[PDB]
């Protein structure tokens, strides 16, 4: 239908325009029909004819007929070739005529078709419902102090401000001559009235604890306010797109429609002030001074003595091997933890050593998404070379090249890069690199692909799902997935990370910033107006309701304390309430220096119908009552602790009218953040959820495999581990855990013995092993068995010590499996247990083939089937302390503190949850396991459903990609509420 | 040996008198946290050579709404309970004219007494439990959220007012651990509280299938 | 008995824009006063925003009950 | 559909039967075309439940259930799992209740 072509950059368009060639625009035509208002343009354009661009192909009558270029009249459907201000998608975008061959548009989001609609209805929707690290750089140029522009160059720039008012601000400096800064151009680029607080990258922590702590000694955290830069440096976290950005603030405040202006004036303003500041990149930015490059070569060096001196070791090799690994897999993890901090000490030194002037630094420091490593390989060092997550194997014989020697373990071979790549690589090190590289290249081929067929199988899997209008969700054949979306039934987009402020600070500090204590009569002076004074002091029954209010609000308090364990106070609730009465501060122009008018009772009562008035379910039925109040508790939960008496009086000091344009906006905004009905939740949800596989790129699976295994419901992971806690005592001590563990752990006669041998006794007093003689002649007398039912062949088995011991064994308790597991007529005597080399033998009571083959095959079929300890299914346990929060346990003090216990846990590759939790002193209320299988088929449908989004969360949150709650929940509550575990459609 | 068989018996005792609360029963609240030391001194501390033997551990509960339900809970001795002693154990729950009854069985029972038990539902209703199910109270685990079953005029308001039918309503499996723990047959209606943290507290509901 | 939100959903508001500028460009009569700009979009937003769109919205409930809506009620955020 | 419900009610009614009493061999003829394999090894697990062999031709009650698996037999020199054969009081019973569960058909 359309002519294809590669895209060209322009960042003259808007970022809703598409540039199309002439030709390719009168190639093909939109179709409009006559209006009487519009006759004479189409009239004119039909007359200029096919042969020039701005006119018309075909004309259809209101019979049909198809008429090639001739009167217009109502009712007659004329395509003319597209022109400016159409709507054309590949996402709609607005078309404007350029005269080369090339698309072009913005590179600010992030070879391909267009198409242009021909009715106006589809037209109309798409319409209405439809800065990558370039302008980064600069941006953070254009903010720096130094930045003075002088007249010229300041109506240059101003001249760029499409949403320029025209006045020109006074300089920030007038004498001895008029001169601007970056700030004030881009205060003036910035729209409306933004408060925003964003901290720098450069920033460092003890700013804020020290002195000088908003002075910003190091040009420190940005603070912005009545919409206008006052201060700081804007990095990528400070305009791009993130959790309070100034770009997210904007749009969340007064829209999408005016943040591309936003983006469009950034892009313009930069760019032309570029033009004349200019950035470049060259080798000068490669050569770091002699001392930093000398430090780096001594590092190395170092390290390289360091691993020279572990290799010489491991030949001594006393070493200690550490538990749970091998000599091989313990020292190779030593050796590449010596060569990662190695290089990364290197890369952190390289990356100080740019002071101010270095290219790479403007980069390194608001780029520093996926800059920083590629830096340090620049000028420090490339690093090591690692292929399946191992260094480089041995090719050859013993040997990675043939330029190395046999049993090469130093830093040299295995594919140690240790000159940078200025200094230029070794043919070694170039070949290690090379490897290093295909490794890469055929994880990236294999990713994206991956990625993309998980991509259109979750898009597939509830592409249905649709919010209907009683504010539920519900999918093709009307089942009920949520009563309400996201369990509140209010849309994503409008939501912003906040802190309840209440759940955190203990009790003593609670109640000493939450009471409003009114037995002072001087603070209240100072915070309050005298008339609201002498009312509050007086008046009794303002005192009541304030105790009152503050003890409901202390009960939602605890609430929160048993809903949210952890101490998180990291919340997503729709309303900002801190960046609201900021806004209304700013507004109203509200002086903290003076008393306020503003009665407390006045914003309690105030909170109470705000409360009264955000309604997500309707009616006064009573369980609809209930569901509305399932659906804004935690809202209102952080209303009331944030819009408090004390907090509004103390620190906001908010007036009557600012309070009540604060409340006004409070119920606003909160009813506009409503998940609107007929919204696509569940592609919107597929899509966020399948967005963060393009990055997911004790041994556990994780990463693609385990989101493949999740969305699956295969009996079969690839590594099911199963989470174990304990009670008490036993949590503390390592010895009562290393007990639980034992008898948890599957224990084999393999594990447990050291060597097995039969041996021919010609009589057992005669005993043909000598050490056991004595012991065999104390046994035999007074026999409890038959000496003349025995067989004439023994075996005789030597167990390991140290295996008897760790696990805590003992030689009746192997006796007493024998005799469950055969019988009376498998006679087995024990030696003893504190006797060195201890030993047990075993006969056969007589009760065809061979003898001697018979004892064999019991041998074969016993040596793996004794089951001495544990569950069979649970292969092995590992035991350690959690460092994480996540697996330690966390509990509520006396004081209100949330104070974390560090405590054994036990992760096990082997999955068996009824037997464990089954199992004495194991904790049967934290104990879990990510097999989901397991889970639904022991603890039910709704703990399989959280045990579900908790590996979901978990998986996507382990390389810190963050995916709102609402999206994993409607993908888990899809494909749970069929009353079991299902896989997706594929 | 004896001491850990002990424990086990406790801890049933525990789980199911645990579960008779949770289902409406009349359970005093001094039994419901029976210690180690009580559960020996009134019953036994070695259930070898029978004094303890799965006899007088039966436990007789009532209804709070109605007295006179009764439902029983035996323990049977033998570790795989056969088609005669339920035949006995239904003729017991006439003979005290009661119609509700859980057994806690070591092994299981055969498919074929399963069916058989099922089949005469109507006039008793009888319910297996194994012993390694009631050797801890799942709905006592962080991943189980609160569960309550809902009354049938609950059922019916809740469906006129959401304007919802049987089969738009998401359903949990009748043979589901939590469905077996309250003892919820096909057709009702079960009211599932859990923790949100975008909304606090949500309250879902699951029709038994 | 009329419970849905007062708002307009923005799907709800494309295709009201959509159906509306169909039938004026098709030479529907218009209720609102008329200026010298032509396009059909725009005379059809800024008669959305006038609040005399000659439309009412049906709403279906999930059962498959209708919703009757005028749009001049539904009043507009944006 | 196609009244299935009756073919497992007869089965299970001739289960409870074979476990009343002593069979006559006409009446377990008759009744085992009409019972799958599962059928009769569940009669088996029941009648062993209440100290009776499992084979309803014999009535004689079992005796002391040795408890233990994986008998060894010097004689013939070979290793049996006898998880099975503690239900039966005797040997002989154990192999002409296997040769009747031979040729149960499978037909539903
Ligand atoms: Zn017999």
Redesign the interface.
């Known amino acids: 239908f359309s002519a294809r072509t590669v895209i060209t950059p322009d960042p003259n368009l808007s970022i809703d325009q598409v540039g199309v060639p002439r030709s390719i625009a009168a190639n093909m035509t939109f179709a409009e029909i006559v209006t009487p208002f519009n006759i004479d343009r189409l009239q004119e354009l039909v007359r200029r004819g096919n042969s020039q661009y701005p006119g018309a192909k075909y004309i259809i009558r209101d019979n049909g007929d198809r008429i090639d270029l001739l009167h217009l009249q109502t009712g007659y459907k004329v395509e003319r070739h597209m022109c400016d201000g159409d709507i054309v998608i590949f996402m709609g975008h607005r078309v404007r005529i350029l005269p080369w061959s090339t698309f072009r548009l913005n590179l600010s989001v992030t070879e391909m078709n267009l198409h242009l609609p021909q009715s106006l209805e589809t037209r109309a929707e798409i319409q209405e419902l439809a800065i990558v690290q370039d302008t980064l750089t600069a941006v953070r140029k254009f903010t720096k102090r130094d930045v003075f522009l002088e007249r010229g160059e300041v109506m240059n720039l101003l001249m760029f401000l499409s949403t320029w008012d025209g006045k020109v601000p006074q300089p920030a400096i007038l004498k001895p001559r008029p001169l601007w800064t970056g700030k004030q151009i881009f205060s003036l680029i910035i729209p409306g009235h933004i408060n925003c607080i964003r901290t720098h990258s450069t920033h460092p922590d003890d700013e804020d604890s020290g002195p000088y702590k908003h002075i910003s000694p190091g040009d420190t955290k940005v603070v912005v306010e009545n919409g206008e830069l006052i201060m700081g440096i804007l990095c990528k976290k400070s305009l791009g797109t993130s959790a309070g950005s100034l770009v997210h603030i904007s749009y969340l405040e007064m829209g999408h429609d005016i943040t591309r202006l936003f983006y469009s004036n950034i892009q313009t303003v930069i760019n032309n002030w570029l033009l004349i500041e200019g950035h470049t990149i060259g080798i000068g930015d490669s050569i770091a001074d002699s001392k930093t490059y000398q430090d780096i070569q001594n590092t190395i060096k170092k390290a390289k003595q360091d691993v020279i001196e572990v290799i010489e070791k491991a030949h001594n090799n006393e070493l200690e091997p550490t538990p749970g690994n091998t000599l091989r897999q313990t020292f190779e993890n030593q050796v590449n933890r010596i060569l990662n901090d190695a290089r990364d000490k290197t890369g952190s030194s390289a990356q100080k050593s740019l002071s101010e002037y270095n290219n790479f630094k403007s980069m390194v420091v608001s780029g520093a998404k996926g800059s920083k490593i590629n830096i340090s390989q620049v000028i420090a060092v490339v690093g090591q070379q690692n292929v399946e997550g191992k260094r480089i194997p041995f090719g050859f014989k013993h040997r990675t090249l043939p330029h190395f020697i046999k049993d090469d373990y130093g830093p040299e071979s295995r594919g140690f890069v240790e000159n940078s790549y200025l200094a230029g690589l070794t043919p070694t090190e170039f070949f290690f690199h090379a490897m290093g590289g295909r490794e890469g290249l055929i994880d990236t081929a294999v990713k994206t692909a991956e990625t993309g067929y998980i991509q259109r199988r979750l898009i597939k899997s509830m592409e249905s799902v649709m919010v209907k209008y009683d504010a539920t969700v519900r999918n093709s054949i009307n089942q009920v997935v949520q009563l309400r979306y996201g369990e509140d039934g209010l849309a994503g987009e409008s939501v912003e990370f906040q802190n309840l402020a209440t759940l955190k600070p203990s009790n003593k500090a609670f109640e000493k910033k939450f009471r409003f204590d009114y037995t002072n009569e001087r603070a209240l002076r100072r915070t309050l107006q005298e008339d609201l004074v002498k009312d509050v002091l007086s008046n009794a029954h303002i005192q009541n309701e304030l105790e009152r209010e503050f003890e409901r609000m202390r009960e939602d308090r605890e609430v929160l304390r048993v809903i949210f364990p952890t101490g998180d106070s990291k919340v997503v609730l729709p309303c900002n309430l801190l960046r609201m009465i900021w806004n209304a501060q700013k507004i109203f122009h509200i002086n903290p220096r003076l008393p306020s008018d503003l009665h407390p009772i006045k914003v309690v009562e105030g909170v109470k119908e705000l409360s009264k008035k955000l309604v997500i379910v309707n009616g006064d039925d009573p369980l609809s009552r209930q569901a509305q109040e399932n659906a804004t508790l935690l809202f209102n939960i952080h209303l009331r602790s944030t819009l408090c008496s004390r907090r509004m009086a103390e620190e906001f000091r908010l007036s009557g009218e600012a309070f009540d344009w604060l409340l006004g906006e409070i119920e606003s905004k909160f009813n506009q953040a409503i998940a609107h009905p007929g919204e696509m939740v569940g592609a919107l949800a597929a899509q966020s959820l399948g967005e963060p596989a393009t990055q997911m790129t004790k041994n556990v699976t994780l990463g693609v495999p385990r989101l493949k295994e999740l969305i699956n419901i295969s009996k079969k992971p690839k590594t099911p581990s199963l989470t174990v806690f304990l009670l008490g005592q036993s949590a503390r001590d390592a010895e009562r855990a290393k007990d639980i563990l034992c008898r948890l752990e599957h224990t084999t006669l393999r594990k447990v013995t050291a060597n097995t041998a039969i041996y021919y006794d010609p009589n057992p007093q005669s005993t043909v092993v000598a050490e056991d003689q004595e012991w065999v002649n104390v046994y035999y007398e007074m026999p409890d068995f038959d000496v003349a039912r025995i067989s004439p062949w023994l075996l005789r088995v030597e167990l390991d010590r140290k295996h008897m011991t760790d696990r805590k064994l003992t030689m009746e308790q192997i006796a007493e499996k024998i005799n469950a597991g055969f019988g009376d007529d498998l006679n087995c005597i024990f030696n003893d247990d504190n006797a060195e080399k201890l030993v047990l033998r075993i006969r056969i009571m007589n009760s065809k083939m061979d003898d001697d083959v018979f004892l064999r095959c019991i041998e074969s079929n016993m040596l793996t089937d004794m089951t001495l300890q544990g569950i069979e299914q649970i292969s092995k346990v590992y035991m350690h302390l959690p460092q994480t929060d996540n697996k330690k346990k966390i509990i509520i003090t006396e004081d209100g503190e949330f104070k974390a216990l560090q405590e054994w846990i036990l992760e096990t590759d082997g999955v068996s949850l009824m037997r464990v939790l089954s199992e004495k002193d194991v904790d049967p209320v934290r104990t879990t396991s990510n097999d989901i299988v397991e889970i639904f088929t022991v603890l039910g449908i709704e703990a399989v459903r959280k045990a579900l989004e908790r590996e979901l969360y978990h998986v996507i949150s382990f390389d810190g990609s963050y995916v709102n709650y609402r999206h994993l929940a409607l993908l888990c509550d899809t494909m749970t509420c069929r009353g079991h575990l299902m896989a997706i459609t594929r | 040996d004896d001491e850990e068989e002990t424990y086990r018996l406790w801890k049933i005792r525990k789980t199911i008198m645990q579960l008779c609360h949770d289902r409406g029963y009349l359970v005093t609240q001094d039994e419901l946290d029976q210690t180690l030391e009580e559960f020996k001194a009134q019953f036994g501390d070695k259930p070898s050579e029978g004094r303890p033997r799965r006899t007088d551990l039966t436990v007789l509960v009532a209804h709070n709404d109605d007295p006179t339900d009764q439902m029983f809970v035996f323990f049977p001795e033998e570790p795989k309970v056969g088609i005669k002693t339920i035949k006995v154990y239904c003729q017991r729950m006439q003979e005290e004219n009661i119609t509700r009854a859980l057994i806690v069985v070591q092994q299981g029972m055969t498919p074929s007494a399963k069916q058989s038990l099922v089949d005469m539902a109507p006039k008793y209703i009888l319910e297996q439990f194994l012993q390694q199910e009631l050797l801890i109270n799942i709905t006592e685990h962080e991943l189980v959220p609160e569960h309550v079953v809902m009354t049938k005029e609950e059922v019916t308001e809740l469906l006129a007012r959401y304007k919802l039918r049987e089969n738009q309503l998401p359903r949990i499996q009748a043979g589901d651990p939590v469905a077996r723990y309250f003892g919820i047959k096909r057709g009702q209606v079960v009211k599932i509280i859990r923790p949100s943290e975008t909304a606090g507290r949500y309250i879902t509901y699951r029709l038994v299938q | 008995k009329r419970i849905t939100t007062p708002y307009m959903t923005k799907y709800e508001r494309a295709r009201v824009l959509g159906t509306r500028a169909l039938q004026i460009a098709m030479c529907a009569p218009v209720m609102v006063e008329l200026e010298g700009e032509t396009d059909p979009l725009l005379i059809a937003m800024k008669e959305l925003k006038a609040r005399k769109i000659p439309i009412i919205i049906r709403r279906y409930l999930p059962d498959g009950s209708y919703e009757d809506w005028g749009v001049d009620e539904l009043i507009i955020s944006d | 559909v196609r009244k299935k419900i009756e073919f497992?009610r007869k089965a299970?009614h001739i289960?409870?039967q074979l476990?009343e009493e002593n069979i006559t061999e006409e009446f377990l003829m008759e009744c085992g075309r009409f019972i799958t394999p599962?059928?009769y090894?569940?009669?088996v697990?029941?009648r062993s439940?209440?100290k009776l062999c499992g084979y309803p031709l014999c009535q004689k009650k079992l005796g002391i259930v040795?408890k233990?698996?994986?008998?060894?037999?010097?004689?013939?020199?070979?290793?049996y799992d006898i998880t099975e054969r503690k239900s039966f009081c005797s040997n002989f019973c154990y192999q002409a209740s296997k040769f009747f569960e031979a040729q149960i058909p499978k037909t539903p």
């Open positions: 497992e299970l289960v409870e476990l599962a059928h090894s569940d009669v697990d029941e439940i209440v040795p233990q698996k994986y008998k060894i037999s010097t004689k013939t020199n070979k290793v």
